C-alpha cells in the first residue's frame, strides 16, 4: 500500500506559506531513496535522521507540509532560523526530526504580468510557535494610533503578495517546499520503507 507522496510533490497548486498545507501520511510503504536520489530537488536537508537510512525505518506518522516561498527564503525552513518566513509564516522546532525538500517552480508558479496568488504574512505581534499556522487577517497596528479594524496609515493588512514575475532573478523566483516530519511515539509504527 504505497504512501501518497505523488499527491504532495506533484499537486498542481501549492498553498500560500501563511496558509501552509499539512497532509498526514500513515499505514503505507514509502520509497524515500527514490526522492533522495532524485535530480528534481535543489534542497534535500534532513535533521535528526540520516536520509540513507529512511528506507530501513518505520514511523508512527509522517506529516507532509507544503507551500511556496522565494528561493532566497528556503534557508529559513530550518531549525533555529529567523526572518519573516520563520517568524511569521512557518516555524520548525529546535528538535526537528524530518527533511526539508525544495525545488525551483518558476515554470509552474510565475506567469506573464506576475502570479499574485501566493501570499506571505509580513506583520505579527509575536513569532509563531513551531508548526503553528496563522490564517487571521486582523489589521496590524504599526504606529501609535489604534486601527479599530481599519486598513490605513500605519494600519496594515498583514498579508502581502509575492507577485512572482518569470523574469525575477533566482533568489526572487518561487520554490515549492515539502517538509517531511517523522513522528517516533512509543506506539505501533505504520509508515515504513519497502
Amino acid at each position, epitope marked *: 500500500n504505497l504512501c501518497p507522496f505523488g499527491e504532495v510533490f506533484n499537486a498542481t497548486r501549492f498553498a500560500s506559506v501563511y496558509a501552509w498545507n499539512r497532509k498526514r501520511i500513515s499505514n503505507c510503504v514509502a520509497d524515500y531513496s527514490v526522492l533522495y536520489n532524485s535530480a528534481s530537488f535543489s534542497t534535500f536537508k534532513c535533521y535528526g535522521v540520516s536520509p540513507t537510512k529512511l528506507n530501513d525505518l518505520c514511523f508512527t506518522n509522517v506529516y507532509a507540509d507544503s507551500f511556496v516561498i*522565494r528561493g532566497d527564503e528556503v534557508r529559513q525552513i530550518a531549525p533555529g532560523q529567523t526572518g519573516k518566513i520563520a517568524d511569521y509564516n512557518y516555524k520548525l522546532p529546535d528538535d526537528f526530526t524530518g527533511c526539508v525538500i525544495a525545488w525551483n517552480s518558476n515554470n509552474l508558479d510565475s506567469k506573464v*504580468g*506576475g502570479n*499574485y496568488n501566493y501570499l506571505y504574512r*509580513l506583520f505579527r505581534k509575536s513569532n509563531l510557535k513551531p508548526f503553528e499556522r496563522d490564517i487571521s487577517t486582523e489589521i496590524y497596528q504599526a504606529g501609535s494610533t489604534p486601527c479599530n479594524g481599519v*486598513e*490605513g*496609515f500605519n*494600519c*496594515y*493588512f498583514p*498579508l*502581502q*503578495s*509575492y*507577485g512572482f*514575475q518569470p523574469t*525575477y532573478g533566482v533568489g*526572487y523566483q518561487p520554490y515549492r517546499v515539502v517538509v517531511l516530519s517523522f513522528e517516533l511515539l512509543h506506539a505501533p509504527a505504520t509508515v515504513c520503507g519497502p
Partner: nanobody
Amino acid sequence: QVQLVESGGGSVQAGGSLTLSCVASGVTLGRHAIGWFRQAPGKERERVSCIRTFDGITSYVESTKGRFTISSNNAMNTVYLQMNSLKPEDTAVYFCALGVTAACSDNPYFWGQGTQVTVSS
C-alpha cells in the same frame, strides 16, 4: 517615513517613448495600490495609471489606455510607467502616488516630488 523615489522622464520628441520608475521605501509593495498622476500646464492634477500590488490588476484613464503600460516588481519594490506614442499634450509633471489601501479607486496618501516630462512637437 515612507518615501517615493522617482526617476526617468525629461525631453522626448512626439511619437517617442519614456519609462518612469518609482521605488517605494518605508513600505513593502504587495498590498497597496500604487500609480501615477500628472499635472499638465493649466490643468488640475489627474490620474494616469494605477496597479493593485496585492493582485496585479491595472487601471488607466481614457487618455492613457493602450499608449501607457504600468507594471510592478513587488520583490524590488519598484513600479514602472512605459509611455509610448507621446504627444505634446502629455507634457506634465508626473507624480508617483501610493495609497494606504489595496484599492486603486481610493485616494493616494503618499506623493513623490514629481518628474518633468516635456514632449516637443
